[PDB]
């Protein structure tokens, strides 16, 4: 059974086909690819873009999305195997996945890490358990990676430069400030897709402690070797933005300080100058800026940058609708 857990599991030809179908749906949005079919959108965390785009995408293709929130309107779910369920969880994922599988044709799942222990969060237990027990395709709506965001981002870039071939473009994935440590998911995904697309990628971050998990650094290395791009880690702002064609910002807590954010607070607070502003963007080769959203203004990026004509964040957000319809169409 084929799922959409990560773009890394898909071949370049399959991803290219997805992006092309997405472009096609953008030209003709109403279709019958999901006529009479349904998708269960399981959210373990809040969402505005993902819930809205998936719900509308199902509707536009003749299907129907059922939105579920375990712990809120639905029952809390247990994922550990061979355990005595006398705690807070009411039912096991083994039953939940099988039951949903008797109702819907697709299952989307959003589950952010707990932020207590990265060693446990990095296993991607929720998503993997759904994929393991579900008899129908499972779609990652964001866990420790955000593959739907990757494709919306990729499409937006191809549309901006007017070509599907992004090789040679200078891509800067820069860390940004936030009063708290966040999920590395979007950063993991940006690094993954930018390298898979063969761009010259530079991972700009405050210190070596902010380098992404080895898993993704390795995916990136393997992607560069196959795509013809390049990977580089940098801690110098100016040399990074210089001649950049694309700048993608995202904040995340240093992995080594996972679970023990107390001492990491004073560390992030001394790098508030990583905020994307006009000065930095002026160093780029008339580069484009984007963010997965939601974005805190004057913290992650300045009002000027957000309101700049070079900001394609709204276009990237729109593309979430189109690429997700291509994904559901391909899996059903």
């Amino acid at each position: 059974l084929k799922h959409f857990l990560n773009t890394q599991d898909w071949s370049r030809a399959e991803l290219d086909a997805l992006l092309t179908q997405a472009a096609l749906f953008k030209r003709n949005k109403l279709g019958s690819e999901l006529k009479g079919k349904s998708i269960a959108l399981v959210f373990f965390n809040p969402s505005m873009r993902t819930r809205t785009s998936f719900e509308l995408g199902a509707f536009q293709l003749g299907g129907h999305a059922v939105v579920l929130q375990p712990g809120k309107d639905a029952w809390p779910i247990e994922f550990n195997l061979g355990t005595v369920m006398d705690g807070d969880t009411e039912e096991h994922i083994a039953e939940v996945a099988r039951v949903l599988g008797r109702y819907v044709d697709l299952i989307g799942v959003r589950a952010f890490p707990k932020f207590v222990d990265w060693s446990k969060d990095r296993e991607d237990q929720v998503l993997k358990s759904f994929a393991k027990y579900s008899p129908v395709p499972v779609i990652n709506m964001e866990t420790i990676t955000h593959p739907c965001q990757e494709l919306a981002h990729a499409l937006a870039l191809q549309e901006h430069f007017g070509t599907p071939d992004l090789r040679g473009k200078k891509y800067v994935l820069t860390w940004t400030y936030h009063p708290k440590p966040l999920n590395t998911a979007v950063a993991n995904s940006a690094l993954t897709i930018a390298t898979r697309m063969g761009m010259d990628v530079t991972l700009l971050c405050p210190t070596p402690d902010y380098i992404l998990d080895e898993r993704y650094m390795d995916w990136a290395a393997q992607n560069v070797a196959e795509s013809g791009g390049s990977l580089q880690v940098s801690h110098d702002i100016d040399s990074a933005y210089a001649g950049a064609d694309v700048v993608y910002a995202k904040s995340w807590g240093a992995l080594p300080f996972f679970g023990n954010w107390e001492p990491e607070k004073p560390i992030r607070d001394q790098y508030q100058h990583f905020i994307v502003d006009e000065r930095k963007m002026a160093l780029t080769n008339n580069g484009v800026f984007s963010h997965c959203l939601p974005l805190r203004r004057n913290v992650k990026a300045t009002d000027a940058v957000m309101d700049s004509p070079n900001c394609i964040a709204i276009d990237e957000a729109e593309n979430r609708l189109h690429v997700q319809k291509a994904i559901m169409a391909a899996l059903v």
Copy 2:
């Protein structure tokens, strides 16, 4: 771009057309006016009638409504301009409105005042910000006015008297009791529409402190001059209900005591006799009674009055469905 923020922004001919389309939809409820289209229903507060009627209205016209709850299932939104977003809000309305605008064809918004400072609540910041940044029409689902309720109310009255011309009818907008101070929204709207319709309006309230905001008292004065009706403020129950054709009840906290409700409590508590009962309704010219709902029985109105054949509250509630379909159809 045309929005539906207040009936006051619309000409009498445009409002008449809306009411007529509403009557038409009431006769033939299924249509294709919104086929393949969608509306984002953004709720910052609870709702039963508004959410249900809008969701069903979109469905009956071939469209689809996406229900969003910021702070609950969606991310909290910031509305202030040029501010450092390092607080509770995750994203700015500038981005939210633009993003939604890439997904849906219409946006409905419900946001009650905070009740901390009327000077700030009366600016109608949430609704105005959506209308300012949204590339698609915005619909008021209740903020400091409730225009959809106005039209449902107006239609119900025209149906009751069997004519679209309500001039000459004696209309009484009376304040009612409630253990707490409420939003003046529905009262502001009732005063607005009753005068726009040219009726002889009397604003019955305990003391001069319960007179509505000047903005609406002025809209009313201007409406009377154009419609041929009349406006009057009264603090005497009996003289008010006398010969009334319509009685609309609604409770609200005295504006001058906004933010400082402590001393206003003992003031409202000594006017519990404003409750609409059989004795008062018996003084009317076989008048009709209604309320926007939800209504607390034996507090705002008695069981007898609510169960009376002269109570058209259920009809007014139904009409919310029909007038909203006319509104969405007109804006799309």
Copy 3:
């Protein structure tokens, strides 16, 4: 007006017709029985299977379900008659049922007992009030009985044995452990339907204190007399499972300890051995096991039993979709 509050209110011919239409829908799931129609699914408690199956069922028949949660996204509702509503409730069921009745064609309602006083919970006030004031058919989505579960369960059994006639089969409704006292609803329903189907029913429970409310014991006695089956209460595990054809497990708090669960805790805790495991199921006549779900693994039933090919819980869950479509189709 015909409602679906309990199978006991329906004749055997009407129930048989429902089960047959359910089997028909299982073969051809898309239809137009609810084209342009809608159902309001009112949930006063969480739900995964019921919300999903009803929402999808409405969709597959061309209709639309509106999901409402009083106290959450909708306003809290008052059910007591002739009372001063100055408390937590905002509106009365008399108005809520009438209003919904002007919007939708069917109303489903889920409301679990409060667990404070069985004498009050057993009156089934919420469901009865909806049926009393609603101008459209009302459907029980689980209160003190779970009739939709009964039919899904019954269909699954007929499919398993390959015949609609279940007379003669040995049916064991066994109590199971849980760190807390639960609703007797599913147990009440299992006893009701198993006897209505004419099976040889044995109510297995720890002590006489765990015998179900007289209302259902009497329904069962009357059912046996009409169906040709039999009813028996047992406190001996081994003699119960012996030669059983079906074993349905469910946990519930002893009625006599309702409201005062403190002393009932040490009582349930000494019967943890009622958990359905391989040893017990091995005593059956190659019997089938099921549970309404959600189910806590290694508490109510063991991993082995749940993963056994004799467990038809997933099939029973699926059937909720089919029998509910038959119910809505019959009532509309």
